[PDB]
Amino acid sequence: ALLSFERKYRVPGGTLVGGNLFDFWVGPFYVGFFGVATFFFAALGIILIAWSAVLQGTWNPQLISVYPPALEYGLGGAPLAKGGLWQIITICATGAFVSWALREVEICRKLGIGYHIPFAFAFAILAYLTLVLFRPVMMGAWGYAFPYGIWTHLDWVSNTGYTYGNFHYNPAHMIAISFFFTNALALALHGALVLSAANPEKGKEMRTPDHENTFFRDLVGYSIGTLGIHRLGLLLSLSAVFFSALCMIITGTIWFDQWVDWWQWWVKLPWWANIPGGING
Amino acid sequence: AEYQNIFSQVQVRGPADLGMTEDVNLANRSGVGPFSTLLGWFGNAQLGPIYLGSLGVLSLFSGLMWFFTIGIWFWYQAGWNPAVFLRDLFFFSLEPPAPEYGLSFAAPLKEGGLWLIASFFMFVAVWSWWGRTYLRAQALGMGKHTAWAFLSAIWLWMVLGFIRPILMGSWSEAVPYGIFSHLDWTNNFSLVHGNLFYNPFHGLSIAFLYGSALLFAMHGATILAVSRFGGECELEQIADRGTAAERAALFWRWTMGFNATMEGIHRWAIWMAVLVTLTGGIGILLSGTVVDNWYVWGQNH
Amino acid sequence: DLASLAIYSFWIFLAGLIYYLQTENMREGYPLENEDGTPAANQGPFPLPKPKTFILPHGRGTLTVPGPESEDRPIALARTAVSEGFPHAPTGDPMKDGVGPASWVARRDLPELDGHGHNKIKPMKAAAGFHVSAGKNPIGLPVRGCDLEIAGKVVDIWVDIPEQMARFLEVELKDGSTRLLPMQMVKVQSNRVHVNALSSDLFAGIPTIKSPTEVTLLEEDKICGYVAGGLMYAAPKRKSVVAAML
Numbered sequence: 005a006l007l008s009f010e011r012k013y014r015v016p017g018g019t020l021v022g023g024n025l026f027d028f029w030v031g032p033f034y035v036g037f038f039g040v041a042t043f044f045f046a047a048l049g050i051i052l053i054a055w056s057a058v059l060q061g062t063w064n065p066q067l068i069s070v071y072p073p074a075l076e077y078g079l080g081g082a083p084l085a086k087g088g089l090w091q092i093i094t095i096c097a098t099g100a101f102v103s104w105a106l107r108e109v110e111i112c113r114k115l116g117i118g119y120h121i122p123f124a125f126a127f128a129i130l131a132y133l134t135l136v137l138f139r140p141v142m143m144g145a146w147g148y149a150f151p152y153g154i155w156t157h158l159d160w161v162s163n164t165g166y167t168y169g170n171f172h173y174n175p176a177h178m179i180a181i182s183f184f185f186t187n188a189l190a191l192a193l194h195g196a197l198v199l200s201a202a203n204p205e206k207g208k209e210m211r212t213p214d215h216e217n218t219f220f221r222d223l224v225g226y227s228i229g230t231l232g233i234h235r236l237g238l239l240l241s242l243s244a245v246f247f248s249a250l251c252m253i254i255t256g257t258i259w260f261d262q263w264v265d266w267w268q269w270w271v272k273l274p275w276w277a278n279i280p281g282g283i284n285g
Numbered sequence: 286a287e288y289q290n291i292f293s294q295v296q297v298r299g300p301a302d303l304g305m306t307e308d309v310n311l312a313n314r315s316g317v318g319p320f321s322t323l324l325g326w327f328g329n330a331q332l333g334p335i336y337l338g339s340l341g342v343l344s345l346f347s348g349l350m351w352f353f354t355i356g357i358w359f360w361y362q363a364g365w366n367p368a369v370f371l372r373d374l375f376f377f378s379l380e381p382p383a384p385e386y387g388l389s390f391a392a393p394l395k396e397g398g399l400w401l402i403a404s405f406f407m408f409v410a411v412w413s414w415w416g417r418t419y420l421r422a423q424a425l426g427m428g429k430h431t432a433w434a435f436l437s438a439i440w441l442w443m444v445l446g447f448i449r450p451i452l453m454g455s456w457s458e459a460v461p462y463g464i465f466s467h468l469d470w471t472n473n474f475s476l477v478h479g480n481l482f483y484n485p486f487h488g489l490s491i492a493f494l495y496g497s498a499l500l501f502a503m504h505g506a507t508i509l510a511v512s513r514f515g516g517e518c519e520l521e522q523i524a525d526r527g528t529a530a531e532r533a534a535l536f537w538r539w540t541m542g543f544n545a546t547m548e549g550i551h552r553w554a555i556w557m558a559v560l561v562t563l564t565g566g567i568g569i570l571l572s573g574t575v576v577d578n579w580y581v582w583g584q585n586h
Numbered sequence: 587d588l589a590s591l592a593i594y595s596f597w598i599f600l601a602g603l604i605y606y607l608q609t610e611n612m613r614e615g616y617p618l619e620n621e622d623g624t625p626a627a628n629q630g631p632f633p634l635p636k637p638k639t640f641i642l643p644h645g646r647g648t649l650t651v652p653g654p655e656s657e658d659r660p661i662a663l664a665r666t667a668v669s670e671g672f673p674h675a676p677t678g679d680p681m682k683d684g685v686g687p688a689s690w691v692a693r694r695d696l697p698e699l700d701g702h703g704h705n706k707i708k709p710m711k712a713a714a715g716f717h718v719s720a721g722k723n724p725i726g727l728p729v730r731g732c733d734l735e736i737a738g739k740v741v742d743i744w745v746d747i748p749e750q751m752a753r754f755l756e757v758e759l760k761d762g763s764t765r766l767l768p769m770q771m772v773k774v775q776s777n778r779v780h781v782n783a784l785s786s787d788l789f790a791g792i793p794t795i796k797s798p799t800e801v802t803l804l805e806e807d808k809i810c811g812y813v814a815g816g817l818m819y820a821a822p823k824r825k826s827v828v829a830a831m832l
């Protein structure tokens with residue numbers, strides 16, 4: 005089944021691998037070489053997860069958890085039921101995430117659009133990879149990575165954060181948070197404007213981009229503009245994730261203590277670190 | 286290499302745009318501000334004009350009053366020493382009255398009074414601004430979508446410093462005005478309520494907070510990927526679908542099996558964002574009024 | 587327990603929200619069809635929404651969605667397999683037939699007006715007060731195609747007034763006529779504007795505009811669809827990254 009305006013788009017081409025071998029769709033989904041590579045990685049990864057569930061002894065989605073190799077194993081392999089599965093599953097996730105992006109690119113080529121989407125996605129893959137691959141490696145142990153489990157990974161965040169006191173003090177973390185909040189704010193604002201313009205008060209003609217600009221200027225004295233707002237939304241969310249990866253990649257590699265202490269560099273600045281009074285005086 | 290439309294290649298500038306008039310009282314609209322070639326690389330280069338009626342004046346006034354009330358306290362906490370003011374800027378905090386004072390306004394200025402005063406200004410500033418987001422839309426005959434979405438944010442804000450503190454019986458529950466202190470408060474709030482990760486509404490709020498970053502990255506990337514067809518002209522693409530809207534829709538359909546419409550995607554967007562503080566506001570409001578420990582609560586659910 | 591009653595109610599709400607949301611995003615492209623253009627058996631769990639009517643600005647009309655598919659022109663593609671799910675090959679030249687990456691929609695053949703009723707897009711020549719305020723001014727530069735051949739020169743910038751944004755580049759061809767090139771499909775360089783999407787020999791075929799001072803939505807689409815189509819259909823004519831660095 006196609007959208008009423010789709011047929012003209014389902015033409016051959018755009019694939020990056022295997023010419024027209026996998027160039028086709030299954031229902032609404034496009035397959036392509038990476039379509040199968042994804043299904044392969046996804047299934048094998050899901051299979052190994054269900055397997056770990058078996059070895060763990062439970063089918064409860066709430067309880068199933070796959071931990072990485074204990075710190076003891078450092079950066080080598082480990083018994084499938086004690087670090088190895090997580091290791092193969094991680095590869096299966098990476099392969100599946102990368103294959104998902106590469107699949108997107110082919111789709112981009114077939115439709116003739118820009119590659120922004122898979123490019124943006126890559127940041128997510130890079131964030132995940134930062135937690136699961138890069139930080140662990142720099143720290144010398146897959147043990148430092150998080151566990152695949154609905155709650156265990158939340159426990160992982162809690163315990164990892166509290167390892168440095170209140171993680172709120174990680175400056176990279178703050179910037180990241182600002183980006184996430186600013187983003188949601190931008191998203192609400194953006195979605196609201198387009199809608200307020202497309203859906204004026206009952207009975208009126210659709211508002212125009214001029215009304216959009218006018219509304220925001222009247223309100224805030226500025227309008228970033230349609231192109232800008234999307235550029236912003238993309239920049240905001242991609243920056244959030246980028247600073248998330250950053251806030252983590254440095255935690256445990258170049259900064260080990262309580263983050264709150266980091267801020268002492270500013271308080272201790274030679275020209276006021278000793279003035280009595282205030283909070284730190 | 287190809288150009289990914291992240292920054293404009295060439296900037297163009299026409300005369301200052303005074304915008305639409307509709308039912309707007311032009312007498313309350315300032316003149317155009319300056320043009321930023323800086324901003325211009327990313328979005329419009331034009332600053333202003335801004336509309337400032339009475340509500341707007343009341344809002345900026347209260348807002349500044351709130352800000353300054355915190356500022357004077359900060360300066361007081363600094364001993365009026367600019368050097369100390371700057372080094373401990375993030376450490377200063379205007380805290381609310383202790384539990385002893387309950388929901389009374391008897392707290393001595395230096396011990397909850399200023400905070401109460403600052404909060405009153407902030408209260409007025411925010412609500413008057415909300416009315417403004419409504420009235421500015423009304424003057425242009427637009428939907429109140431912004432006003433409504435703003436409420437969702439206001440909801441979390443009101444719950445944190447007004448609604449919940451009242452329900453709890455004291456201003457001491459409210460959030461302090463300080464960079465770090467308000468962070469300490471957040472952490473503390475989790476600690477005192479049995480870890481907020483076990484709060485279902487905190488988990489949701491995060492799903493939507495991640496989802497907003499996920500969706501805007503998607504939407505923004507999409508639009509930019511079809512801007513070569515004028516996809517940014519969304520209102521236009523809504524009224525008269527173009528290959529831009531079709532290719533955007535098909536990319537997602539072929540990728541994840543379903544898609545949106547030029548107008549519908551913004552509905553997904555507004556809810557994704559609005560749900561953030563909506564669920565979150567509920568999460569917080571329930572904390573300490575109905576649930577003292579989310580871990581505990583979680584055990585029976 | 588309130589918390590419980592709350593989280594319970596929320597999921598109902600969320601499911602309904604998603605439902606509502608999903609149905610709203612079916613105001614276009616639905617009902618689904620089989621590759622042969624007939625109603626597809628499966629239409630999905632969500633039913634088409636109640637129609638809504640958009641009162642268009644400046645009596646340009648109304649848009650009622652969902653409604654009957656506006657696309658009825660001929661699609662120059664032929665099935666490549668009896669079973670559903672396969673590509674449909676171009677029967678002629680996809681670039682010219684307007685299919686594949688070069689598809690275009692039969693949008694309204696009028697230029698878009700701004701809030702004040704003036705063509706939203708104008709050539710700078712005709713945009714009072716508009717000028718290049720930053721960045722290399724593209725005007726006057728020679729336009730090079732992926733074949734690394736000159737296909738013309740930039741004679742003007744078409745500006746989106748409301749957004750004070752450059753939308754197209756007006757490129758004069760060898761024959762003296764001009765074509766609009768999407769701004770986001772050209773790379774303004776120091777000594778020339780490069781168009782990777784098209785080769786010199788394809789510029790002539792870029793759909794032309796009726797009036798030299800305005801462009802309509804239908805024309806825009808036709809111009810954009812065509813220029814994008816080049817990425818795929820001009821591949822043989824396009825030069826390598828190494829050839830371009832010479």
Ligand code: BCL
Pocket residue numbers: 101128129131132134135160161162163164165166170171172177180181184244245247248249250251252471472
């Ligand atoms: C007590 C706990 C600590 C704390 C400890 C930590 C730790 C520890 C970490 C964070 C991290 C983050 N913290 Mg913190 N944090 C605290 C309090 C806060 C507060 C707040 C209100 O107080 C806020 C707003 C934040 C905000 C954040 C975010 C910036 C960041 C997580 C987003 C991210 O990186 O995504 C990145 C994106 C991804 C991980 C997604 C990858 C998705 C993959 C590519 C695709 C999945 C496909 C899927 C499997 C298929 C599904 C099937 C389909 C649905 C069909 N923290 C407290 C103080 N925080 C994290 C960070 O920076 O991470 C880098 C982090 O590690």
Ligand code: BCL
Pocket residue numbers: 050053132135150154155157158161482487488489491492493495496499
């Ligand atoms: C750096 C940030 C931390 C982190 C911090 C948190 C915190 C803090 C919270 C979550 C929560 C969630 N996390 Mg997490 N999370 C991390 C990395 C991941 C990864 C991954 C491959 O990297 C995945 C798939 C998830 C997935 C999830 C969801 C199950 C859950 C809420 C959905 C959401 O926020 O969607 C954002 C995305 C969308 C809305 C799009 C659709 C995504 C769907 C909903 C996710 C399906 C996940 C799926 C069940 C995993 C199984 C896949 C199968 C094996 C194939 N997290 C890293 C380690 N996560 C929330 C929760 O309730 O946890 C219990 C929560 O509070």
Ligand code: BCL
Pocket residue numbers: 161162185348407410411438439441442470471472473474475476480481482486487489490491492494561562564565566567568569
């Ligand atoms: C140790 C700390 C606890 C914790 C304690 C809390 C608490 C406590 C809260 C959150 C809340 C949130 N947490 Mg938490 N949180 C933790 C860990 C996390 C992690 C993680 C580890 O990854 C993540 C991703 C999150 C994520 C989140 C967000 C979903 C949510 C905040 C939305 C928001 O910022 O609205 C920000 C928006 C507002 C506050 C709206 C109000 C803004 C007003 C209207 C405007 C004021 C303007 C003002 C006058 C200044 C003007 C500025 C000038 C114009 C420039 N938390 C840890 C476990 N978290 C909040 C929530 O709702 O939870 C359910 C909350 O209250």
Ligand SMILES: CC[C@H]1c2cc3[nH]c4c(c3C)C(=O)[C@H](C(=O)OC)c4c3nc(cc4[nH]c(cc(n2)[C@@H]1C)c(C(C)=O)c4C)[C@@H](C)[C@@H]3CCC(=O)OC/C=C(\C)CCC[C@@H](C)CCC[C@@H](C)CCCC(C)C
Pocket residue numbers: 042045046049050093096097098100101104108121122123124125126127128129151152153154157241242245495496497498499502503506540541
């Ligand atoms: C980079 C910035 C933001 C962003 C962008 C982004 N995400 C994206 C994209 C983009 C641009 C896509 O194009 C792509 C998409 O197609 O969405 C519809 C996607 C996507 N983002 C997703 C999720 C997601 N994104 C997130 C975040 C973000 N995405 C950022 C905020 C989050 C979180 C935690 O915040 C999540 C959960 C997917 C829905 C989708 C990518 C789908 C995909 O890759 O499918 C291939 C694989 C499978 C179907 C199965 C893999 C199964 C196993 C191999 C592994 C699983 C094991 C383990 C790793 C999971 C552990 C889970 C526990 C922690 C609960």
Ligand SMILES: COC(C)(C)C/C=C/C(C)=C/C=C/C(C)=C/C=C/C(C)=C\C=C\C=C(C)\C=C\C=C(/C)CC/C=C(\C)CCC=C(C)C
Pocket residue numbers: 352353355356357359360401404405407408442443444445446447448456460461462463464467
């Ligand atoms: C004057 O000094 C110079 C330098 C100019 C300026 C210096 C100013 C400075 C340094 C200002 C710093 C301000 C800061 C750091 C503010 C930080 C705020 C933060 C970090 C968080 C805010 C959280 C606040 C919330 C959640 C507030 C909620 C408030 C309400 C819900 C309203 C409550 C109202 C009450 C109790 C009053 C009751 C009144 C009635 C009857 C309605």
Ligand SMILES: CCCCCCCCCCCC[N+](C)(C)[O-]
Pocket residue numbers: 428429430433434436437440555559563
């Ligand atoms: C606690 C406040 C909750 C506010 C929820 C508002 C969501 C905004 C929804 C936008 C759609 C508006 N509407 C009525 C015009 O359709």
Ligand SMILES: [Fe+2]
Pocket residue numbers: 194198234504508519551
């Ligand atoms: Fe948009």
